[model samples]
Target chain A: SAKAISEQTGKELLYKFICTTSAIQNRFKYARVTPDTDWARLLQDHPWLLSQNLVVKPDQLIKRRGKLGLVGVNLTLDGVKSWLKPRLGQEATVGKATGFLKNFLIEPFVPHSQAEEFYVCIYATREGDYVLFHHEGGVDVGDVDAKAQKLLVGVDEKLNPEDIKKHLLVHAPEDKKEILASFISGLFNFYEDLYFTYLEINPLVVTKDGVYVLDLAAKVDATADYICKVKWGDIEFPPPFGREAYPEEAYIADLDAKSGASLKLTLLNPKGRIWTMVAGGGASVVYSDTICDLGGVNELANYGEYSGAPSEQQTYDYAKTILSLMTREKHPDGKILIIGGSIANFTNVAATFKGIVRAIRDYQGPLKEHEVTIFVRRGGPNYQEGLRVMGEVGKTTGIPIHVFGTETHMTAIVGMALGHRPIP
Target chain B: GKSTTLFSRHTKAIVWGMQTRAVQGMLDFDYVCSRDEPSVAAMVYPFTGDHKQKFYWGHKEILIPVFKNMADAMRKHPEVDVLINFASLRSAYDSTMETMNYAQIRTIAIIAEGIPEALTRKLIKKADQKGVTIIGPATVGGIKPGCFKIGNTGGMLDNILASKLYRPGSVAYVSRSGGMSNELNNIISRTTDGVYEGVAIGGDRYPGSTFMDHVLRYQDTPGVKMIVVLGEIGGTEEYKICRGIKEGRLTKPIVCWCIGTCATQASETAVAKNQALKEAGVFVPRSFDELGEIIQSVYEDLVANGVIVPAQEVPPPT
Candidate 1:
């Protein structure tokens, strides 16, 4: 049934356990068990085991564990001990193996009751729906039969919980009614009035007590600022994620906490050939998406924003931090840091550019070493000043700096980076 | 008796004489004093060597070092009493990196122009370190007697005397601009005919203390019934005050006015636009006139239910 739903949606969905210390704690909490020793140190050393696929290998071991069929050494004490002795030597193996086995064996394990998994996405918009499916968990759920699973519940705008339950029962078998109802109730409770823009809980674990959401990736609606206060305590919405935040990224985050401007930074690939210092948040996202689409994702080094009418000095400080991070070492492919943002409404573009110019002057040597190319595009108040300064700085620094005013498309720089013809 | 008389005479001289000189200076050609009998005397000396040509000479024997010592009262304090700042012309220049204008200079001189800018800067820095929020220097400064008269008759005159006109209640006054505190108190006293529980704030841009610091104290101060906040433009400090308000930390309704339009295109300037204050749900006045009106209205609102005493009732049947 899950395979049928996956096929219909044109996306494969597989249920996988994301194991962690938190999961272990939850299991312990469920069982009302008090751990005799601190599990933190043991967990920290072997974080990969936190995933459902608990595989550990040394640097010299076979490279591909799953495909090479070398994974799953053992679940039992003697088997794991036998497996470890060959790799780590008997003395070192016995001590570490005993600790690992003791920690793993003492914890209670919960089993999945059914092959079927369900997910209910309650969006703020009128198009609300719930998807239910039953199939063996695997990567190719999309290749399964179509009639096995169904969209059990669909409400256009208004939805009554009791009414939705009736539709769910029609799709679910009579034997699974109580269990499915409980699962639906848990799902509803988690999502109801949450103001989530996107919610995907893949491979929800159907347990004896109720439905256990094994995994969740959600983006809460930032527009609902007034209602989300209790949940959001000074949290910067839409944070740039993935890579470890660079020093410049961290500094911008600190400034965002105190300043009114929306300061955000993401170190995409620190070793990437292209770095970006975009001005506006929207512009930053667009630039990143374009770069990923054109130059490929691995080519972009960082993504950041400094917007909402920042002062020249503040902008300068922010620019300097970005430049320092970008010019760490010369990229073999050469490096490009695009300084782009949409035309400002009230912001003085020239003032902000002045800061950029100052940072460029300070980091000329490093930028030259990295063969940095700067592309500028901005508009709004004092844009002339911004253009003039950037142009002069480019000449003085002898760096291949490109400047574009509101006369060009906001994404003109992205095209330029892609080696496309310049927007006239 | 001699000490008491001397103290009384000095206090009276400071209040009345300083006020008289200030008013005269404001009204006439800068007056000069031949003798320094008054607390602050002004002398007009000729700029040119020609005796016929005249120039203005000003002198104050109020002893700034003594004032500095008095201001340093917070040093011995385990906790801050109030962050007081005297916005003398010199202090203003030293606190902010902005260039001084003639109007600003003249305004600062009215308070303590004779003191060097560096001394004012050092004193302010020292006061800030001490965690003093509300400061009044050179002028008559104190909370008791409801009398905050500084440089003579500049502060709350009736409050200082503990006069019948002083009717104590729970309301704390905070200002980032000095002298305005006394003016507000006087207005409140006149409008409501009552005295506030406390007035513990001062005006200095980089205040030796902040409004939030005072708001926290006012929240705990058993005597404080409410808070009247006077804010000026140029920093994100007030936004912190607003955050405190939004978090249900400050239950009292704060009547606030953030003065000045930010000239610089800095992030701090944008945040200083009072947007955060509005979000924090503070009662913001659009203009200085509106600020006075709102404060009066708040006092009236409080007084109708006995939150604060009316102006007529301040000096109870005196």
Candidate 2:
């Protein structure tokens, strides 16, 4: 049917149909054409990019890169090149352009055509499966309408297709059965053919022109690379925003490229009133949740962490960078920076606080301008010294700092901020 | 078995005081056991805090000999497996240190590894070697079910210790701070439907026992199958214990809770609490509720693994 449609169009429709053998090669070839763009450079940097090769492009009719800042049309090789050059720079090398494009691609944006929206989302365990509702949908669907449009179809993978067909006919309308069946079949194809970790198609367009994948994103299980070479091309896994791939983020990215520690930074509101330099990932979540619970989400300037026991200098650098960014604009509301964690069984509070104290001393002027309040709650080995030193630093810096030991509860620092009684 | 019985009796006596007082405070136990006689017949009496009264009532005479024997044992076998350096001198001027010296004790046991492990092991070993267990280098003592305990003079001491040490079931606990150990004992006792026993080695790096040594002891302790280890980062011993768990040396269900996640530049100030727990086969719960859930899950899993018989309901204490 795709071949028939291509023949009917008269204009040579180059449908890049990818299967187990040719997907990687096709991605490489497609990427080669747009060498100056992120897609191409990503392919070059990570030759394994072909492995996760689901293409997502904006629909027609919407102004290119306008509403939600997506400004390219068709996303052909030429289209990508032309759009990439001005923002990425005309004289920029292929490497630089590619890096810029990678950032551009991951950002959230509204879909192009609402009518062509078809989504195939699956929530499956190794044992059972559920098919997420699909609508002729796109991002523009309002909340209530979206809920009403959702259709769920459950299938047991262990059952034969003929048996599943009998059940499918009973639940779905006769007119919608054929398309739904094809969708289900496609899902089975995906499940059996490749180890896809996540597959999302926001708008699976079912136009009179036939079913078209308007926008799609899929991630293959990275651990399945051995047998998945052909399905996945040389793909470059981009680091989350504000985090350069590296040990010290960029430094670590440059050194041991395959390090497990994830480094990410998101500037929620750069000019916001509060900032945090949290340690563990879980702690970061708790701190953020506390801030939000206290009605300070809008006041939150950034969210990030230094979980891998980063070096003092690395932590210093991260702290300095965040402080600099946070203090870029003075806010009417005084800034509050919470350095909080539960209790330490191992991490040295004094040692880590020393780096923080040092940073405070260095950035005393800006911190003072913002009227920053520092809250430190930690206990473990050398806690007394840690508390004592941090208390001294707070005095020295003239910042109103509150210090609590393990004798205090874990959320005591949060309570201090929200004016709640500390955990008893 | 004798020491266990004596300790349990002492603990019960302390708990009785706690119930009567309604406030946790210092209770001292002094006894005389003659090593030369090898007779189980030894006198045990409550050692009150009033020095003159205790001395006049023969409390001092009874404890003085016991203390002297402890000191002499320390002097003779300084590296004995258990070293209890009680802070019992009449003068509150570094009494713990003086007690250690009187016993002719040289080097207190040091935890071979991580801060928590080292501190815990040192305390346990000190107790094991010395006939008496001392509460503090900076002690804030507590009351068990029936015993005289003296460490620091704090309002929270009795309740904290009673809550930690007097439970009717078998949960093992290890801590670095005597105060924290007491506090956790209180919290866990009041909170969990489970019973537990705990030991808190002091905070200094070279205290009597290591956390791992106590954990290993608990692992082999027929009564203890579930352990809750409280640690703070600053030493590598917790990390080593985590390594042991991974290597299958310690095969009991362990729940490790740690404090301190604030950014620290100084290694001495940082306690890799979260990281160590992950390594130690602990299901790190983010909150107390989550901690309860983890405990429940662990119990269920243990039953599933056939480590213990599945209980449709709470089983009677062994």
Top-DockQ candidate index: 2
TM-score of chain A of 1: 0.59
The prediction achieving the highest TM-score against the true structure is: 2
User: Across residues B44-108, which tens digit of lDDT does each residue of candidate 1 receive?
Assistant: 11121211112223432222111122212223331321122234443433432211111111111
lDDT of 1 by residue, A1-424 (tens): 0001111011111111221221212221111101253346545644433443222222111122223443333233234334444544221222123212111121112355435454433332222344444433222234333433434233322344465456644665455556655544544443434334344544445544544543334544443444544644453332221123456666888887677565777675777888788775445655665676464577877766777678888888888888888877777867887888754533567788898899999999888888888888866567777899899998998998888864455656777865775634
Clash number for each model? 44, 101
Q: What share of the true interface contacts does candidate 1 keep?
A: 0.00
lDDT per residue as tens, model 2, B1-318: 113321333222111011222111222221211011111111112233312112211132222122223333334333332222222222222223333343322222221111222123334343444543343332233222222233221123223233333233446677765435534543454444344456655554344446776677677777665887766645655765667788888887788755443321343332355655674567676643245456667766766676655223221111
- CAPRI-wise, candidate 1 is incorrect
lDDT of 2 at B30: 19
Cα lDDT, all candidates: 0.46, 0.45
What's the DockQ for every one of the candidates? 0.01, 0.02
Predicted complex 2: CAPRI docking category = incorrect
Tens-place lDDT per residue, model 2, A1-424, is 0001111111111122222221111222222222244455665764543443332222211212333555454344345445655654222123122223332331112234554454555433322344454444465533423442223332222424443345533444455456555655655456435544344445555544344444444444444444444654453443322222322335433322333333446666677877777765445655776676566677777677655334445555566666666677777767777776544333455566776777877888888887778787654445577788788988888888888765454445766765665422
Q: Judge candidate 2 at residue A202 and give its lDDT.
A: 51
In terms of lDDT, model 2 sits at 0.45
Q: What stretches of model 1 exceed 4 Å from their correct place? A: A1-107, A111-126, A129-162, A171-175, A197-219, A222-226, A229-245, A253-260, A267-274, A281-305, A331-337, A368-375, A392-404, A407-424, B1-318
- Chain B fold agreement for model 1, TM-score: 0.51
